[PDB]
Amino acid sequence: AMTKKKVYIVSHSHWYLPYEEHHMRLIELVDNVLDLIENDPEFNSFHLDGQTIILDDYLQVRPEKKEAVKKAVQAGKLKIGPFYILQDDFLISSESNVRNMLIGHLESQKWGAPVQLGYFPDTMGQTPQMMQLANLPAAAFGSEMWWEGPDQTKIFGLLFANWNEIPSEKEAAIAFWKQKLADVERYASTNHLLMMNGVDDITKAIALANELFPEYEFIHSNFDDYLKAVQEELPLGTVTGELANTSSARVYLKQWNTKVQRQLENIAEPLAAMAYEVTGDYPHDQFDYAWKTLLQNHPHDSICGCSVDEVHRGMMTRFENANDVGHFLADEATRQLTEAIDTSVFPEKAHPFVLFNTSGYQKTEVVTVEVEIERLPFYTGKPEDLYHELKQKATPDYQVIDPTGKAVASRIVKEDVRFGYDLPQPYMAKYLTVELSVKEMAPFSWDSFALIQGETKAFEGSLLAQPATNEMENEFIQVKIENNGSLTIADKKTGETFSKLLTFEDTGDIGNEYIFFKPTEDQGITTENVTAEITNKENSPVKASYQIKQTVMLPVAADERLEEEQKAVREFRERLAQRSTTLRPFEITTMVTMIKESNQLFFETTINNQIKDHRLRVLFPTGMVTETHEADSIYEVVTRPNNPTNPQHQQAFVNVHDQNKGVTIFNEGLNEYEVLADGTIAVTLIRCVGELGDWGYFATPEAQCQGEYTFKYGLSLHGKPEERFATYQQAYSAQIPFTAATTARHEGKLAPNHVYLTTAEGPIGWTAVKRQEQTNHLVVRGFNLTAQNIPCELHKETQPATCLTNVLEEPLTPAIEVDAPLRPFEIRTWRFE
């Protein structure tokens, strides 16, 4: 007395090397897949690995086969998508993940492919909500359970595991199958058994398998079918929410990635989206191209910096290209936008310019704007003489004014004289850089100003810094730079004080691109007993800044042993190498900057890294010992607990807080952090290492990160827990500069001051503003930082939003009202028609 079981054999690809070498092999794999599809009528389907890009890469080498490809996708014999590319998810932005799915989706429609499950063959809490917002209610992970995200959004999930190996003989196969079957049924919760078939003669072998077992039916199948079958008979089983040394391998790739992400998501996209109002066009196709290029840097063996030298050089080009497209589109957008602004309101002879808050946040910053002050075309004289004319010429004092004509406090930072050229004409031009203080400027808005000859209206009030003691202060905070060059800070509003901040710490690293490993006898070097050179560089009533220089004596490299232990592939934990006894001076140079209207401190650290096998972090002792901390993640701030080390991955910031106080450290492209047991927040600036690691020996000398680096990060203190979120918002806003463009005096359709979107206040992450693909509907997306139901209402000009959509920009199932509170941890998208 038994019960029958169905075994679903699903064929799929299961497969260090330079890009092209893997690309040529791809061509071969897809050749064979397609050879079976055409030849073997019994062959159900093949699973094309969760990513559409594989067709692109295939067809760019082999375009004649497009017809064969369309056919097999249309007959459901090739199963493609739903992502564009398989992404190293933790490492990239919130939006990059979404955009992967958006592109993946649209590319699947282009093929007439129906939606496949999300596919995760190798390796973030909001995945459940994200998938559902992309209509992927099932996903497969490399036996079956639900996975719920922070929003109580739930997804069905498969734990599959691959357990030509199949024999051609009856006696062998019987035992073979009996054994694989036991392995499958151990974990299975139904009588529907998944059996993955990896590739790199199955109809024959399946039919043998059906001959052999009366209680087992063996069928060549696919995920779609197996999902429908298994879900109807499911009993049990839930997983909830959510090595990090890949976060700090090859920093410069992380820095670049951050930069182009922010260039597309926060600059180019919102500006184009506004420019459409005037122009009636939106460059959908170019954006799509920019994003693909960027996303090609996003796999699980590329952005991690955890591969071979040639591959990462390749990523550098892709980064520059997408960045250049980003800049191009943003430039077009602002030129179209400023041209339409009515600047006739400035007097004759004035030099107008426009500031855009292109983020969703109240922005406060002392900003600089470079304004062209005189221009000499090459047709006026010999260029060298034009240069010297302007360079010799003495410069009038200048005033900035608003549209009403009132004066606006400012400061002239710098004069420059240089060569330039326009469209659509070469010249010499003279430029001024003007400092302006911008305070709580409204999200998604612009203001116009003009530079006019006259007496500069000086900033007024106390100097922020007092250089005699290396101190500075505003209403929010008071700062002392110690002889150390470390900072002691007082929160003027909570009374909490903090000490030893900004200490730098260097240790050896003899691990590899994947993992950090400190030589067994290494105690580390620190700037705690270093004598800093401290200089006040700027002091005004609105902004002050200090330069801190430190020389530490660092080992030049690991000693001689390392290269041998790498060559012998000696396991990293067993390594006897130590820091070298040859020491050289290592210069660390930090700018600490403070502005009147903000509690944030900004740091810029610069090094010229000419030493190897090491790691440099900056520490922020917190004074609070807790079990948990908070880190920025994916559409989410996650609570985590704090191999003796505990490296972790962060986005914009990490936070440690009490019932009474908190410290928020934010960063651009500095993705690894540790929170030490004493409460120190240690951010990794740079990790230098000689090999790839893993299963063999692959020298990666370029992973040593030699050369000049500048790291941007910062600090914010808060009081009672609730104040956390404002610090998080500012951290986002800090990564998004104002855009500044000059224009001529001209009349226009548009106001010189305007709020394009008026946004709801409260703990919300503002994330995308763009337009929809054939529709051109304005798309805006944001997310709830909190576990609470939050009043949220968006307007564009007067106008309210049409509907709420999902991440593919389609209306929600069911229809939630635009008017409705933003649910806990909700990722919301608005459509504006």
Annotated binding site for Ca(2+): 213, 216
Looking only at the bridges linking them, the beta strands covering 138-141 and 118-120 are parallel
Q: Indicate the residue among 192 and 612 with the shorter CB distance to Ca ion.
A: 192
In whole angstroms, how close is the CB of 210 to Ca ion at the nearest point?
4
In whole angstroms, how close is the CB of 199 to Ca ion at the nearest point?
24
Annotated active-site residue in 31, 122, 422, 819: 122
Looking only at the bridges linking them, the beta strands covering 410-421 and 216-220 are unpaired
Give the residue among 797, 655, 648 at the shortest CA–CA distance from 727: 655
In whole angstroms, how close is the CB of 234 to Ca ion at the nearest point?
24
Going along 99-231, which residue ranges are E strands? 118-120, 138-141, 144-148, 154-159, 192-199, 216-220
d(CA 662, CA 496) in angstroms, rounded, equals 9
579 in the Ramachandran plot: left (φ > 0), alpha (ψ -120 to 50) or beta?
beta
**Intra-chain end-to-end CA distance of the chain, in Å:** 63
In whole angstroms, how close is the CB of 163 to Ca ion at the nearest point?
20
Q: Which stretch binds Ca ion (CB under 5 A): 210-218, 375-383, 580-588, 761-769?
A: 210-218
In whole angstroms, how close is the CB of 12 to Ca ion at the nearest point?
23
Q: Which stretch binds Ca ion (CB under 5 A): 80-88, 205-213, 327-335, 810-818?
A: 205-213
Could you tell me how far CA 25 lies from the centroid of its own chain?
A: 30
Q: Indicate the residue among 141 and 213 with the shorter CB distance to Ca ion.
A: 213
Going along 541-599, which residue ranges are E strands? 543-555, 583-595
Q: Indicate the residue among 209 and 271 with the shorter CB distance to Ca ion.
A: 209
d(CA 791, CA 820) in angstroms, rounded, equals 7
Q: Indicate the residue among 146 and 213 with the shorter CB distance to Ca ion.
A: 213
Q: Which of 32, 179, 210, 535 binds Ca ion (CB under 5 A)?
A: 210
In whole angstroms, how close is the CB of 225 to Ca ion at the nearest point?
18
Bridge partners (DSSP) of residue 140 are 119, 158
Looking only at the bridges linking them, the beta strands covering 154-159 and 138-141 are parallel
Decide: 603 and 591 in contact? Cβ < 8 Å: yes
Q: Indicate the residue among 210 and 608 with the shorter CB distance to Ca ion.
A: 210
Q: Indicate the residue among 185 and 309 with the shorter CB distance to Ca ion.
A: 185
Q: Which stretch binds Ca ion (CB under 5 A): 204-212, 310-318, 360-368, 497-505?
A: 204-212
Give the residue among 766, 784, 779 at the shortest CA–CA distance from 821: 784
Decide: 267 and 739 in contact? Cβ < 8 Å: yes
Q: Which stretch binds Ca ion (CB under 5 A): 203-211, 270-278, 424-432, 560-568?
A: 203-211
Q: Which stretch binds Ca ion (CB under 5 A): 206-214, 302-310, 434-442, 658-666?
A: 206-214
Q: Indicate the residue among 210 and 483 with the shorter CB distance to Ca ion.
A: 210
* CA-to-CA separations, 287 to 187, 330, 665, 776, in angstroms, rounded: 45, 11, 32, 13
Annotate each residue in 253-292 with x if it binds Ca ion (CB under 5 A) or - if it does not, as one string: ----------------------------------------
d(CA 785, CA 638) in angstroms, rounded, equals 10
Q: Helix (H, G, I), strand (E, B), or coil: what is residue 505?
A: strand
Q: Which stretch binds Ca ion (CB under 5 A): 168-176, 202-210, 330-338, 768-776?
A: 202-210
Q: Which stretch binds Ca ion (CB under 5 A): 113-121, 134-142, 212-220, 681-689?
A: 212-220
Q: Indicate the residue among 43 and 213 with the shorter CB distance to Ca ion.
A: 213
Residues 6+ apart with CB under 8 A from 228: none
Looking only at the bridges linking them, the beta strands covering 503-508 and 614-620 are antiparallel
Q: Indicate the residue among 220 and 796 with the shorter CB distance to Ca ion.
A: 220
Residues 6+ apart with CB under 8 A from 510: 517, 518, 519, 558, 562, 565, 572, 575, 577, 613
Give the residue among 783, 796, 789 at the shortest CA–CA distance from 831: 796
Active site residue 422: no
In whole angstroms, how close is the CB of 773 to Ca ion at the nearest point?
49
Radius of gyration in angstroms for the set of CA atoms belonging to the chain, rounded to a whole number = 30
In whole angstroms, how close is the CB of 181 to Ca ion at the nearest point?
12
Q: Indicate the residue among 199 and 212 with the shorter CB distance to Ca ion.
A: 212
Residue ranges at the known binding site: 213, 216
Residues 6+ apart with CB under 8 A from 404: none
Q: Within 13 Å, how many C-alpha atoms sit on residue 469's CB side?
A: 10
Neighbours of 581 (CB within 10 A): 8
Decide: 359 and 266 in contact? Cβ < 8 Å: yes
Q: Helix (H, G, I), strand (E, B), or coil: what is residue 102?
A: helix
Q: In this chain, which residue has its C-beta nearest to Ca ion? A: 210
Q: Indicate the residue among 213 and 252 with the shorter CB distance to Ca ion.
A: 213
- Residue 788, interface with Ca ion (CB under 5 A)? no
In whole angstroms, how close is the CB of 193 to Ca ion at the nearest point?
13
Decide: 20 and 206 in contact? Cβ < 8 Å: no
* CA-to-CA separations, 54 to 24, 120, 134, 728, 735, in angstroms, rounded: 12, 16, 20, 38, 34
Decide: 84 and 292 in contact? Cβ < 8 Å: yes
DSSP state of 721: G
500 in the Ramachandran plot: left (φ > 0), alpha (ψ -120 to 50) or beta?
left
Q: Indicate the residue among 210 and 462 with the shorter CB distance to Ca ion.
A: 210
- Amino acid residing at 681: I
In whole angstroms, how close is the CB of 217 to Ca ion at the nearest point?
5
Decide: 501 and 621 in contact? Cβ < 8 Å: yes
In whole angstroms, how close is the CB of 212 to Ca ion at the nearest point?
7
Could you tell me how far CA 95 lies from the centroid of its own chain?
A: 8
Q: Which stretch binds Ca ion (CB under 5 A): 208-216, 389-397, 545-553, 666-674?
A: 208-216
Q: How many residues bind Ca ion (CB under 5 A)?
A: 2
In whole angstroms, how close is the CB of 140 to Ca ion at the nearest point?
25
Identify the H or E element spanning 277.
helix 269-279
Question: Residues in the site for Ca ion, rule: CB under 5 A?
Answer: 210, 213
Q: Which residues are catalytic?
A: 122
